[PDB]
């Protein structure tokens, strides 16, 4: 039911600053040029990059190659994750190794400070199932949410 | 058994290529005729560089039967112009005179829209 | 109509108009949709 | 006098001329022309009004599209309307002709007789009835009585 | 059972040469076919005087489009799209929304009178005799662009043609 | 923002460009390409015009459905031109005539009008405004028209300080009156050229390249306010170029040589026609006055545009004027060159 | 009903009316917009509340098979008043 | 019997059922499969090179006299290696009876042509051609019958699409109608309209 939200608040024209510190509907041409110049002007840890919670793997690559050119190398993300230790290097480091579908093989669960139900709601529902189907001990280490 | 097929004129590659010369060959010889019946505002060398635009794109081809298809259907189109089956707007639409030059860059082809 | 009169309804045209075209009160046809993507204002302020 | 007053009565005879004796050049395409030849049959009568049944294109004031117009057919018939001598008027019959109709999405198809050449009046229909075309032609007649050639040189 | 059309042998008695030979001579059956056009010319012509006389129809009839109301004024239509989903032409486009009193109505209705082939069939497929099309066929235009109708248009049909169009129906939903 | 339309489609016929455009004279030669061209990519087409509906008829195949929407009004009635470009994006003014008439002269089509239609669309909020002048607008001209030419160009700039104000030479095309005028002259014997055509130098231009001159010059940001030269890649005698139509016409050429006290005074002849005149006093002076160099000025190369030259369409132009279908060639007509 | 917005084009029932700044009100330029100025929300708003003696009443819309199908609405809600998912004619049950 | 069913003439289909053996043992060279349908219709699947030797058997042998081509088509099935499927239909005039005769034939195989045979194949044969781009050897007259001169395609195959890939329109520019890439004002709108339900049992097919 969140589609809705992609109709409203769209930004649908390349917008730069004017005169007077407002942003005002400009064209491809402007717009790129404008942040061309700037790009140039600057270099290394002068530039970096931020990417958020909906961005694509082919951007996110794409800003990467083009932020190395300058040779920066501040891609950073807002979500954190330490990298103390191995860090992103070995992706086991990062991931769900078990697998959504690994849940109904489990016999004891461990979850630590997450609230998965709404998280991620649907691979609390396959805890559930094994909950109720294959009599799953699940143990919470965190705040006591239902 | 499995690479068996049956052919249509030509039975290899050196027997397809003598009839795509000899239907280049009257082709050739068809454009002044086409430009002066027509009443074409072409030139004779506009016409031809088109005969030759058009061969040129099936110039990778390797398969006979598919040669001989292309031979066929280009013999069909000399016999639709030089027997005047064709009117001046079909033999016109060769050249595309009233459809503005489509980018071929990446960047003049990001501005308009979204197709690649 | 003067033996068999038509049933009289609140939103019949007492009037009758006869064919409009090539007069200035001709149809124009038009959406009736309103717009279905609604575009981000920006502020009216300045940031810095 | 004020010369806007010959102007004005020329006008209408010139008028008058024109729409009494508008003799249409049929194209007869598809079903679109039985309903035509309807039209002209004794019911309806169009030679009453001063519209004979046919005419050659160099002897035709109308046009009348009647029929699916496909690609094929399509460069025919703007040379026989480049050929018609003026004033020349087209009348658009049936759905076909005038939006492409139940053939509207064919790869064969003219989309509307219109993108071939300018319509001065569109008849609704699939076909429309014989006296619909002739309310067609009726209307085509007002707009010739509406037209002021004359008025509009006078006063360049 | 099959009959012959052509196969006859003429007769050659010197009677009957004769008759055939004044045939040829003296025109006889051309002058004969000249009595029937005679006859015709002495008949009254089948013409009427449009516009002042109109040729007849029936209550079925199939011309101009119209939605029609409830009598309370309530629009028939229901935004269900089954005369959409049947147009053989594909005439009709439909958006719909829910109304700011909660009913099922439209927001777009057009039918692109020159797509349309004007068969009826979306008037079959109503369940609620909204959209018909009515007894109007005299509704040429001098623009393609008059004849794309939208909601507004048929509903001024409707409230134009409704002491017309309820008779019609009237007098023809029970063979329906 | 109440504008950037936001081009949608492919460039086709049922696309849509984003351009609104107010075209003032579209029912003549000039006028009739450029709605084709602005149809063809989708743009929505206002046309003022003043003559019958019947002769628009033309017009309405060169757009989509809704695309080109006529009016009436009036040269000298402000109100009908606000009612035209109010809701424009960019006003095109293509008025003008080759003859005055008993109710509009040089001063009203030229100076007038142009001047009534951008103080309008000043004010109505139109970002681009495009004018078309001649090449030979002088003040210190003979010719009446190019007098006032120059006048109205000059009053253009200051009611619409961003106007872009193109300067043709010249167009030539199936329905100009500049090689169809080298042509019908064979009604009359031979072809009086004063001086015999010596002392004129012609740069004619293609009405095709006008025109693309004139689109590519609404979606360039840099063209406003700015002052433009459409001509031809070659420059002309006017006894070399007269002589190349008949040449491609395939007619007799009887040239004669006539002096200029004289041929104006069969040029006051021809002005008495209550219809359009075949020759005029100003047209005479024109046909024969030279085309001016403007290396100041940008061209159509800074439009992106290429000149076509005259030689490559020249032959549709006369097409029409030869006798014979299939004949069965000319040479390229002489050519001044450059520097 | 039929309003106005502030340009003087009026707003259909469907609540479509072209902005102040929309070069497609050009098309409506010596010519007229069709409205319908029937609004059917407010007509349907002017039929009583039909009393009834039950809990489920029948609406076919009048006119039997000119109507429409036949639903059944149910009364049980004494807080609102049963509408009919076709014609929108209101029923209320007799104070019980 | 019921009033809104079909009566089945058991009769007609033992007769057809005979007669189909006939021909899959006079000419076992080229015959693939015969059936019978449920409404009487005999079906004859051959080799495309017994086109000649089965069209010849039918049309001349004593108790074929298959003296009419009714009707001479193609259908295009994508999933099939030989995508194409010619189906001749013929009529009997002494046995009163009608044979449907079905080969196959891919872009680039050709079939030989049946001219010969029937002269009624000619125009047929054309369409074939011009709507599918199924190439018969040795056609007296071959090119397109339907399309556009110069068109460029085959329209009755699937994957061509329903609008096609140009359409025409008048430019006064250049004085004469033109072609250009086909843009609709509105898009030929795409229903879905098979139902999730399996609806006839006897038809189902093998997992
Ligand atoms: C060949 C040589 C011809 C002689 C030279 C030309 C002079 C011709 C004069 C005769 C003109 C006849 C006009 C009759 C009009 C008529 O019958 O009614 C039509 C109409 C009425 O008929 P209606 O066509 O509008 O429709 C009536 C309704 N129905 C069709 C159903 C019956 O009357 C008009 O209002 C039109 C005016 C006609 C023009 C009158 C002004 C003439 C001015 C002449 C100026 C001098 C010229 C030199
Ligand atoms: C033998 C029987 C012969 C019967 C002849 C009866 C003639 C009846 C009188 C006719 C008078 C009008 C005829 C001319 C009509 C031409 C026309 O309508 O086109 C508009 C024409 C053209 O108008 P225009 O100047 O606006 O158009 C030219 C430019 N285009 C086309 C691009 C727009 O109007 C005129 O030229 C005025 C004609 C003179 C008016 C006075 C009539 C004098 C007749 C000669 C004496
Ligand atoms: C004792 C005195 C002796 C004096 C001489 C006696 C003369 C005896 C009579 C002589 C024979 C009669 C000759 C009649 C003319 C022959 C015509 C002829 O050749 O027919 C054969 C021809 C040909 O007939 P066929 O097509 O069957 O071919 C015959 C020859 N074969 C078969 C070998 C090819 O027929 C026609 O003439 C065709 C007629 C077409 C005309 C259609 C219009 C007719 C409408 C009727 C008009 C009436 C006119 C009245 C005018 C009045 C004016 C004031
Ligand atoms: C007011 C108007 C008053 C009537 C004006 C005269 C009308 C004449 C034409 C209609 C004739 C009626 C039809 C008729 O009876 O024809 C059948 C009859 C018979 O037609 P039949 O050809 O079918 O007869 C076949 C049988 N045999 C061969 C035996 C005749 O037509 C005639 O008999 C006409 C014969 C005389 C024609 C002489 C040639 C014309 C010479 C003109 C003078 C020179
Ligand atoms: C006098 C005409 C009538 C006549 O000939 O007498 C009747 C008689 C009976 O006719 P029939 O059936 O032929 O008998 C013999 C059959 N074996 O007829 C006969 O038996 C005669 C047999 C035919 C021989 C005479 C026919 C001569 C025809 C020549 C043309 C005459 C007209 C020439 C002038 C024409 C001018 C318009
Ligand atoms: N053609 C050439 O060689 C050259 C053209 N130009 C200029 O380009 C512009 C286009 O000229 P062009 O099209 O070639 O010649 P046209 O005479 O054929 O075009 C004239 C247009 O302007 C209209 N017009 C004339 N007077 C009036 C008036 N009082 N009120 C309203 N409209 C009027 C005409 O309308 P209507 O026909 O309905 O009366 C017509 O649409 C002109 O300004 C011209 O001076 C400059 C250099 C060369
Ligand atoms: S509009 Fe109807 S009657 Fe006319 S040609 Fe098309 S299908 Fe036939
Ligand atoms: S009459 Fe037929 S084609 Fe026309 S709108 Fe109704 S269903 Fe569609
Ligand atoms: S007109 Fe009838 S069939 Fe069409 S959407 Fe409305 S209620 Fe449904
Ligand atoms: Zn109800």
């Known amino acids: 039911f969140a589609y809705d939200g992609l109709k409203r608040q769209r930004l649908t024209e390349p917008m730069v600053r004017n005169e007077k510190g407002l942003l005002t509907h400009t064209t491809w041409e402007d717009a790129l040029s404008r942040v061309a110049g700037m790009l140039q002007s600057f270099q290394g840890n002068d530039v970096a990059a931020i990417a958020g919670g909906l961005v694509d793997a082919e951007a996110l690559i794409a800003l990467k190659d083009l932020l190395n050119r300058v040779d920066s190398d501040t891609l950073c993300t807002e979500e954190v994750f330490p990298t103390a230790g191995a860090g992103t290097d070995l992706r086991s480091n990062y991931l769900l190794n078990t697998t959504i579908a690994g849940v109904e093989e489990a016999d004891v669960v461990l979850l630590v400070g997450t609230n998965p139900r709404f998280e991620a709601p649907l691979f609390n529902a396959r805890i559930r199932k094994s909950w109720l189907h294959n009599d799953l001990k699940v143990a919470l280490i965190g705040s006591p949410v239902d | 058994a499995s690479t068996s097929v049956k052919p249509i004129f030509s039975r290899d590659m050196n027997e397809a290529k003598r009839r795509v010369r000899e239907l280049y060959r009257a082709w050739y010889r068809e454009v002044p005729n086409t430009v002066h019946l027509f009443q074409l505002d072409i030139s004779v060398k506009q016409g031809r560089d088109k005969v030759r635009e058009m061969f040129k794109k099936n110039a990778h081809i390797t398969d006979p039967r598919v040669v001989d298809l292309l031979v066929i259907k280009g013999k069909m189109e000399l016999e639709e112009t030089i027997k005047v089956w064709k009117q001046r707007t079909h033999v016109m639409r060769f050249f595309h005179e009233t459809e503005a030059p489509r980018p071929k860059d990446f960047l003049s082809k990001f501005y308009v829209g979204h197709d690649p | 109509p003067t033996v068999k009169p038509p049933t009289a309804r609140k939103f019949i045209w007492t009037n009758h108009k006869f064919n409009l075209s090539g007069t200035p009160q001709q149809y124009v046809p038009y959406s009736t949709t309103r717009k279905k993507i609604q575009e981000w204002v920006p502020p009216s302020t300045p940031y810095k | ?156 | 059972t099959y009959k012959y059309v052509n196969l006859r042998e003429p007769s050659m008695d010197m009677k009957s040469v004769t008759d055939r030979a004044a045939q040829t001579l003296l025109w006889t059956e051309l002058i004969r076919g000249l009595g029937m056009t005679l006859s015709y010319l002495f008949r009254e012509p089948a013409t009427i005087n449009y516009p002042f006389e109109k040729g007849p129809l029936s209550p079925r009839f199939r011309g101009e489009h119209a939605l029609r109301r409830y009598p309370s004024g309530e629009e028939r239509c229901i935004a269900c799209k089954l005369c959409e989903a049947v147009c053989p032409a594909q005439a009709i486009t439909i958006e719909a929304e829910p109304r700011a009193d909660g009913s099922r109505r439209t927001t777009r209705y057009d039918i692109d009178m020159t797509k349309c082939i004007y068969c009826g069939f979306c008037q079959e497929a109503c369940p609620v005799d909204a959209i018909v099309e009515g007894p109007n066929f005299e509704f040429s235009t001098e623009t393609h662009e008059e004849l794309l109708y939208n909601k507004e248009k048929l509903l001024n049909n409707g409230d134009k043609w409704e002491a017309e169009i309820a008779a019609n129906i009237q007098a023809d939903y029970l063979y329906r | 923002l109440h504008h950037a339309v936001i081009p949608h489609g492919k460039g086709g016929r049922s696309s849509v460009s984003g351009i609104v455009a107010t075209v003032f004279g579209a029912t003549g030669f000039l006028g009739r390409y450029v709605v084709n061209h602005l149809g063809r990519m989708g743009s929505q087409v206002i046309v003022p015009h003043r003559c019958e509906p019947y002769d628009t008829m033309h017009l309405r195949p060169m757009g989509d459905l809704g695309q080109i929407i006529f009016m009436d009004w009036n040269g000298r009635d402000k109100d009908s031109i606000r009612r035209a470009v109010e809701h424009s994006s960019v006003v095109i003014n293509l008025v003008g005539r080759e003859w005055e008439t008993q109710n509009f002269d040089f001063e009203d089509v030229f100076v007038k009008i142009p001047q009534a239609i951008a103080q309008v669309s000043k004010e109505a909020g139109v970002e681009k405004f495009i004018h078309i002048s001649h090449l030979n607008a002088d003040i210190k001209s003979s010719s009446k028209y190019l007098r006032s030419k120059a006048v109205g160009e000059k009053e253009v700039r200051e009611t619409f300080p961003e106007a872009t104000i193109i300067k043709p030479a010249e167009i030539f095309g199936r329905e100009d009156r500049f090689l169809n005028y080298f042509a019908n002259i064979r009604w009359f014997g031979g072809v009086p050229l004063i001086s015999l055509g010596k002392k004129t130098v012609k740069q004619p231009v293609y009405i095709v390249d006008v025109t693309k001159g004139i689109i590519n010059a609404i979606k360039d940001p840099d063209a406003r306010g700015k002052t433009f030269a459409f001509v031809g890649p070659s420059r002309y005698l006017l006894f070399d170029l007269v002589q190349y139509v008949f040449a491609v016409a395939h007619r007799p050429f009887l040239p004669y040589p006539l002096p200029h006290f004289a041929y104006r005074w069969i040029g006051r002849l021809f002005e008495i026609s209550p219809f359009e005149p075949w020759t005029t006093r100003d047209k005479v002076e024109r046909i024969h006055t030279t085309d001016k160099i403007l290396p100041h000025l940008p061209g159509l190369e800074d439009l992106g545009v290429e000149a076509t030259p005259l030689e490559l369409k020249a032959i549709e132009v006369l097409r029409r004027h030869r006798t014979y279908r299939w004949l069965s060639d000319v040479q390229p007509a002489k050519t001044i060159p450059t520097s | 009903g039929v309003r106005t917005s502030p340009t003087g084009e009026k707003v259909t029932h469907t609540g479509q009316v072209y902005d102040d700044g929309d070069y497609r009100k050009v098309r409506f330029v010596g010519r007229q917009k069709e409205v319908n100025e029937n609004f059917a929300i407010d007509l349907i708003a002017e039929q009583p509340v039909s009393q009834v003696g039950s809990r489920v009443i029948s609406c076919d819309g009048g006119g039997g098979a000119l109507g429409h199908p036949r639903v059944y609405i149910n009364l049980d809600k004494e807080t609102k008043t049963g509408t009919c998912g076709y014609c929108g004619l209101q029923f209320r049950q007799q104070h019980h | 019997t019921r009033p809104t069913v079909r009566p089945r003439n058991d009769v007609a289909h033992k007769q057809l059922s005979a007669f189909g053996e006939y021909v899959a043992e006079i000419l076992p060279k080229y015959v693939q499969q015969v059936q019978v349908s449920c409404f009487n219709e005999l079906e004859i699947c051959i080799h495309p090179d017994g086109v000649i030797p089965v069209l010849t058997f039918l049309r001349d042998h004593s108790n074929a006299q298959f003296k009419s081509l009714a009707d001479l088509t193609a259908v295009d099935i994508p999933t099939r290696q030989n995508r194409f499927e010619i189906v001749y239909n013929l009529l009997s005039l002494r046995f009163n009876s009608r044979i449907r005769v079905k080969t196959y034939t891919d872009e680039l195989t050709p079939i030989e042509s049946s001219v010969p045979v029937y002269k009624a194949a000619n125009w047929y044969e054309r369409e074939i051609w011009d709507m599918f781009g199924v190439f018969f050897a040795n056609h007296p007259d071959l090119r397109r019958i339907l399309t556009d001169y110069g068109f460029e395609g085959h329209p009755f195959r699937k994957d061509f699409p329903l609008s096609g890939y140009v359409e025409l329109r008048y430019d006064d520019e250049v004085k004469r109608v033109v072609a250009e890439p086909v843009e609709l004002a509105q898009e030929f709108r795409k229903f879905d309209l098979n139902s999730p339900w399996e609806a006839f049992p006897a038809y189902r097919q093998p997992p």
């Not at chain 4, 209408?12 to 035509?36: H, K, Q, Y």
């Open chain 4, 1 to 156: 006098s004020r010369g806007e007053y010959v102007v004005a009565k020329l006008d209408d005879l010139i008028n008058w001329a024109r729409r009494s004796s508008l003799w249409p050049m049929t194209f007869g395409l598809a079903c679109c022309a039985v309903e035509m030849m309807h039209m002209a049959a004794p019911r309806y009568d169009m030679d009453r009004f001063g519209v004979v049944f046919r005419a050659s294109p160099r002897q035709s004031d109308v046009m009348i599209v009647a029929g699916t117009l496909t690609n094929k057919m399509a460069p025919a018939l703007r040379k026989v309307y480049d050929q018609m001598p003026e004033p020349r008027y087209v009348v658009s019959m049936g759905s076909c002709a005038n939006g492409g109709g139940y053939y509207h999405y064919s790869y064969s198809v003219v989309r509307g007789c219109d993108r071939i050449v300018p319509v001065d009046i569109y008849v609704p229909g699939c076909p429309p009835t014989a006296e619909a075309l002739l309310y067609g032609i009726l209307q085509l007649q007002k707009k010739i009585k509406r037209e002021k050639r004359l008025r509009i040189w006078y006063r360049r």
